[PDB]
């Protein structure tokens, strides 16, 4: 009943909403799911925005807050909606959907702590008021509260659910991955690694045995995975999620009795500007069914065959219970079976790489009779048994083929059954009162016995037709097609099924006595088109051209799109020239207390910040220096540092520079810093900008080599509050009152190190391993005193005593390799902060001063620590279309690059990005001259831009197909 | 040390040999391996052919038997050769390499049976004479005898080895997958399934502790997999073999001590004409490193990184021994380790889908100091430890990066080290005499401690350089690059290394003060090029464009190819017009005895045959007839049948048709039949053509559902001769005569064993035909022995009339499954129809060479509907203008949209291959050698197999358009 895809209105240009949703509908989806992110609607703590307006430079004009329009569009296209308002959403999104002003109100995020929960009450009021009319009109059918509250806190979850129930009485309310709930329905999120089924099967089984009688759903069935900078890969951080894998998970879920399924993500789209979670790529492509740029991937067509089956047999599927009577002949495939009054499904699962030939035992009969069931490699086949065709004399005793769909056309029931090229299928039809006749088109062999017709078909690139005629004037029309044509079978309106090679059938409009269809043709979209309809078809036209039209039988017409109308086009577009202009950088600077977290000084945006530090060194300290290294320690996230107008260094979180630029008296330090967004864990406060400080002279280091792991149990359960435990870990303090080289799994780790000189400064660095977009929960204790959750480097000087000291880490979740840096001095001075850059504030991305021409390659080593604007013009002499989407590629090194097109922020790329390209949405592109603008922060003496290009992924042809209709009978 | 790729001279147009072999050379290959197929050189049992010419219509003019020229070309390009002359080769090849005349000479194939072996002695004489000069010149360094004789027969293998040792004294001689051999070296063939390492790891472990002291080699390391019609898939029958999988297998093999490895296939190419094994596609692309059309796949660049490492650290690799001195800090990756005096390798294997951060314990030191070792997902990383750079004061204590190569340039050692974009690596260099100085280009942080420099590097899209200088006269140049540029690092000779984005570097001409190299540029080939050389470079040109030249250090130059020079072209070429001509089919028909196989009538070619059957029915037979079905039963492989000038039916091996065109007296049956090739098992005789017969009136069936599996054991071992056991299964006859004990019943005959069932025969006037079922038929033919009432009938090869073995009442059938699966049923027929049979090889249009020059046909507007021509043969001629020079940098595939045909494809008179409804694709590679600039003649021969049949159209498609450009170094 719920055949759902995740599509985020906040990750899709508003004009492309229709394209993305209709592609899900055309796949047989009947529901779309989306988060409603609190920080998307209320970033500044002002008027909640549910309009098209943005107050943020980094959010392009075509991204919208108009949730009402998204919901109406879903309704108009025939989709229901699942709403996921948070307040936490995770979703690889800045602060997991928390507005960055929340960190000023509460430490105890994701709890009933009033400092947090009062703001959650006001958010739910704003958002549930917008949802209200759409719940009443039965478009919005489900509300998720919170998101993967793994740890229990039942009264937190129940309070959220009670507010939804007060505003929206009777609406289904649930959460995901909180197994400790008795009354609020729990739903599961499944992201197993390819090929071994046991972990997935075991999680489905436990979930199905849980919460007896409550709503059952997979709220996130793996539809791919996300991409990150720093530690990421293309096409996902987990490499390719095979489309074969996704289909096996879906068919396994159907085999085990889950008929409520949401693919996460179905379409991922793009992360607008600085709404990324920390380290997230600008792309949210997700290797999804619908790629970021709108492409229907192999994963789309496999999911489509499953959703089309589940949609065109909801009767049977809703009736099914767990079964055991059916058995297999061979061990070459597994069996998952379900049984209902009027039919069964046998799911034959072959996770191995060799084709399997299977038979079933159903009531002492070995089926099929003359041919085995093919189970392809890396495939699970749904086999239909004992299916009653209601209000007819027909029973489908079995098919060894795969049923796509079943449709009533007056006196005829049509079923489409598919197989591979060269597959033999066998279908047994039983007819009450006997078989009157069988008409066949193509290669069908018939055996008759009693009231049965047996049909043996050799599948090809085409359809074989069998009509089994009853004595009561009712007919069964079987259409045997290949898997490829089943994938490109399009159900338009209702009473029009197109069996084709056509890449995509979009909008349809039935006015006059005419159906107009918007087809998108790829290279392989030409050749044979079957039309299955009760409507009289007089003519089919493709632009001007009248197509050949054959009547194959009643309800079936054949035509062809000529092979010439399918093109193999793909174009690249080069800049006319490159102009350079240096950003002055400074614009608006204000005093700030040293190490004062940006969000506690009214700065709620990520993106670029500039610090000016005025730091004081005198005779005695320069005099006594034991080592000539300056350290900038504890910032989110990436900085380029200049000292006395000389480039010094760059990097993430913690940088060691040369001290040589240092003089006696005042030293000026410039920090150009990027915040890539907050993590998406939703519990910890990882402050934007410099939360740490400046240190001088590395005098040594203390490596925490070896740890004693001790049993410790976090009391996860319905009564547990994780936010309360992180803020007050009394049970750990208690355990501390009172072998392993790697701290990489849950538990309490203790080690001892020596301190000789307490005039030194001691900074614990959590190490490279610790930093992940879904931030780890690791609690730091120094000599049995709670320092806090690890968020970054931390000065632990004030917690140290002379001689033997103790460090303990309680890993609730994650990995860390800590090391202590020892510094001579902690440098002090006056601090100034700027939000943004002069060029951004002055909107140079909308209109740049004219700069100098430059011949590529553009060498930037001399501008290390500076900001360079690079403007180019690209001719694109056609209409921007979803039929021909464009990517911008930049060949550069030693830069953090912000990309704009015609003054719209497209995203960022850096040296540690998993790709050198961005999707340029059709809404940003114009026919003619296009302005491509790079803002380049220069991070190295080895730095440059070799070039850039706009690339078409493909060029598909948009064509209108017109059906001239006659009279229905 | 043997870094080998399988490339078959008989599957590559001769003009393209150089391209395929140089691409193997360029990957770091030092050896090419090839079968020499007996049936390729002696198909007709006449003068053994080692020339360019062909006796066969279906073998294009550009395929060669000139083995000498291949061996010469391999030698010229700096490659050694492993030769594998069979006599059996398997290789998805017709009869596994046996000439089809062998079936007239012997039943006991692959044995010392004289009827087989005397002909093996003549073949081995012809072929070892061709090889002798190349063994003496040290080009051919190994000879494989036989091929996967799994079952033992040591005296048979010994006898093949003796003939080789006598003609080519002291040449290395071995076989593959015969683990019962004590004296002759055995080698291993490994084709595991992605992601569980345990089966592969256990096979390697067992092999490495077999045969004390003898030659150790993986003679076939999975390079992909083949594709079949009927039961096959794209891109292989096992779907995609992931490129990450192939690299994990290679790195595992290195980590376990195997340094002799052959990738099967490195390049697969094409199966010429009817030299396919049964059911095989005309493509042998194999999803190989080099695709059939010449493309360098992702698999190629991954294998190239491994071969480059093994070549560039030869001294280290030769020295390594087992030893377990190193430990890992965490469980997120496994460790394989080898140790020598020169240093150690730690292979960190991560078969999971998450990045692992790893540390090593070496001495009592935790390695590295400031940075963890990245082990990427689905990856095995080779970490070097304690590497002594011989004749220098440098030790590489460790690098968390991956070492690609090491090269001496005068007083400087250069090492290339790689990682992913954004990877942090840590490298520890110890200098004896102490560290004079470290000069750096790029993002290299230095920590000096002892006589040690620690170098911490963020890997980028480009190179960071560190020159560590000794207080003596000697320098360590470290170049830190990304994986992608390591993959496109090209070694043009001893002192010319290009670190690049370039898709491929081909031939070089090392003139005087000029180096000219042929580059092939894809769309990502542009950007930075680094040149590492001892040579003085004044200028670098791309054709006529002089490039920017920066001197980075003494041995390192930097340049760039402008991003504008890398196009993204891709063109489709369309036919002008279609002309149709009906083949008259009949040309020359001669008498043949009913059921007499074609090889017993002097027909040794596969391909198309036409039978005319003159069958007699009298009034009585037709009057008494109980069921209206005619069956053609037992033929190889596919038939289209007409009765009294009406299309009756089509299919593989066993066809049931309507009997309604039949009438009293003579009935004229036309059978148009294709043999797709013999199977590649090399043991059984599966006859071409009609070996069964024609039956009328299907009056029932006996389903053989339920079997008793007994405890019979085939005695495999050094003394076992499997051909002798197949010919004379005496132990099975004895097992069948003894008391049965109680045993398990099964519905599945799918694993080795003796299976027994029982059925009722009520009427011995009927005819009983056993059908082995769809499951039975596989290109590598199964071995299942049929017994009826305890009498040996024979190995199953197809449907078999078993009537004469039956008695009234309860009958027994027993199957000894040596290997395979079967699901048999007995068809019961009223009559066996007798008459006179006639055979023709080919069709009128083939014999008269219409593919070389077609008569004028009628023009036809696509789509061309053929359903009214069911059972008949139609020639479709068209012209495709191709207005460029045919080139490997722009290869073409012919696509045909059709249904209900078997199609034979010719281009400019050259047989390209076959396509049918049950093909895993609708396209063929058209080699450059068949294409011409200007008008291309595309000719299809369509056997119409159905009343729903036609050709919608066809097109020539370029896979891609790369740019060919010379890079010129002025010295």
From TrEMBL, chain A:
Intrachain S-S bonds: 332-356, 526-566
SMART domains tied to this protein: BetaGal_dom2 (SM01029)
A single GO BP: carbohydrate metabolic process
Beta-galactosidase domain location: 317-489
Molecular function terms from GO: hydrolase activity, hydrolyzing O-glycosyl compounds
Family of this protein: Belongs to the glycosyl hydrolase 35 family.
Record's protein name: Beta-galactosidase
